[PDB]
Design a binder for this molecule. Structure first.
Ligand SMILES: CN1C[C@H](Nc2cnn(C)c(=O)c2Br)C[C@H](c2ccccc2)C1
Length: 109
């Protein structure tokens, strides 16, 4: 059901982008912030790119969406110190989006 999938993902992403811990991940990492980021992290992803992918019908499966979302967090944990503000935000956002994924029946409760 592509129409159910699209609206469900749109509604989920709107909530994720509204969370206070989403701020580090709203737009792509800039080279000024981390000059080697795009050599280290080979599949960079952020919530603006995910919005763009959603709206162009890239997410033809739930799993494609969940893979990008989980990679926002995984990239952050690979690049940044494990005890850092970005990693704290990643963990907070992760906790929230798993609650929402469960609420939406998009993973097992
Ligand atoms: C585009 N850029 C991404 C930053 N997030 C970053 C930066 N560098 N690295 C290495 C990261 O992992 C993340 Br997440 C957060 C920043 C910002 C966002 C809001 C307010 C102040 C700063 C806006």
């Amino acid at each position: 059901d592509p129409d159910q999938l699209y609206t469900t993902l749109k509604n989920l992403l709107a909530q994720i982008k509204s969370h206070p811990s989403a701020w580090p991940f709203m737009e792509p990492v800039k080279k000024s912030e981390a000059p080697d980021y795009y050599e280290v992290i080979r599949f960079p992803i952020d919530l603006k790119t995910m919005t763009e992918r959603l709206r162009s019908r890239y997410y033809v499966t739930r799993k494609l969406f969940v893979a990008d979302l989980q990679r926002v967090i995984a990239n952050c944990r690979e690049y940044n110190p494990p005890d850092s503000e970005y990693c704290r935000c990643a963990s907070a956002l992760e906790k929230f989006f798993y609650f929402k994924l469960k609420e939406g029946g998009l993973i097992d409760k």
